[PDB]
């Protein structure tokens, strides 16, 4: 139990923010791991 | 068309982040407007 | 170490989605617990 | 004005949800456009 799930979200504004996020989170699995690591490094520089 | 929607999210980690968010976004409608305005002020102080 | 944090987000679209979310998540602490429980119940009805 | 921004988020749980999201949203720019389009198609199948 960890595959696709259904998220009931009320309100267009709310749905859109999460929908774009669902795409960002889901797509993060389709981005080459080595390329994500590099980004994490650029981000590791400063969380500010 | 702006009521509750269904968001298919794959991966437990992904689902949990959005699920907690769905709750935060949805609940934001149940928090007294005047009280949210006050918070926005405290937040308006600095986005840093 | 769990108070306010700084999140560096690149891209306006990205910043806005998270900013509105920061407000939703942060405000969730300002909404009466008993009132949130009631919502969670309405949400507990179905995650679909 | 649309580059990196700073998001002040209070509470570890809150910060973590948005932080992982900041990474997902930001990384979405590093994932080949043609590959994202394919995903969007798989997602276009059903929003349920």
From Swiss-Prot, chains A, B, C, D:
It is found in: Nucleus; Cytoplasm. Residues 1-30 are annotated as: Interaction with HIPK2. Expressed in striatal neurons of patients with Huntington disease (at protein level). Brain, kidney, placenta, colon, heart, liver, spleen, skeletal muscle, prostate, thymus and pancreas. Highly expressed in fetal tissue. Expressed in the respiratory epithelium. Induction: Not induced by DNA damage. Isoforms lacking the transactivation domain block gene induction. Residues 1-36 are annotated as: Oligomerization. Phosphorylation by PLK1 and PLK3 inhibits the transcription regulator activity and pro-apoptotic function. It is linked to Ciliary dyskinesia, primary, 47, and lissencephaly: A form of primary ciliary dyskinesia, a disorder characterized by abnormalities of motile cilia. Respiratory infections leading to chronic inflammation and bronchiectasis are recurrent, due to defects in the respiratory cilia. CILD47 is an autosomal recessive form characterized by onset soon after birth or in early childhood. Belongs to the p53 family. Maps to a chromosome region frequently mutated in diverse cell lines of human cancer. Appears not to be frequently mutated in human cancers, in contrast to p53/TP53. Hemizygosity is observed in neuroblastoma and oligodendroglioma. Activated and stabilized by interaction with RANBP9. Participates in the apoptotic response to DNA damage. Isoforms containing the transactivation domain are pro-apoptotic, isoforms lacking the domain are anti-apoptotic and block the function of p53 and transactivating p73 isoforms. May be a tumor suppressor protein. Is an activator of FOXJ1 expression. It is an essential factor for the positive regulation of lung ciliated cell differentiation. Possesses an acidic transactivation domain, a central DNA binding domain and a C-terminal oligomerization domain that binds to the ABL1 tyrosine kinase SH3 domain. Found in a complex with p53/TP53 and CABLES1. The C-terminal oligomerization domain binds to the ABL1 tyrosine kinase SH3 domain. Interacts with HECW2. Isoform Beta interacts homotypically and with p53/TP53, whereas isoform Alpha does not. Isoform Gamma interacts homotypically and with all p73 isoforms. Isoform Delta interacts with isoform Gamma, isoform Alpha, and homotypically. Isoforms Alpha and Beta interact with HIPK2. Isoform Alpha interacts with RANBP9. Isoform Beta interacts with WWOX. Interacts (via SAM domain) with FBXO45 (via B30.2/SPRY domain). (Microbial infection) Interacts with Epstein-Barr virus protein EBNA6; this interaction inhibits TP73-mediated apoptotic pathway. This is Tumor protein p73. It comes from Homo sapiens. The gene is TP73.
């Amino acid at each position: 139990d960890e595959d696709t799930y259904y998220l009931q979200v009320r309100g267009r504004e709310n749905f859109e923010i999460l929908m774009k996020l669902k795409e960002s989170l889901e797509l993060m699995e389709l981005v080459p791991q080595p390329l994500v690591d590099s980004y994490r490094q650029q981000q590791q520089l400063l969380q500010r």
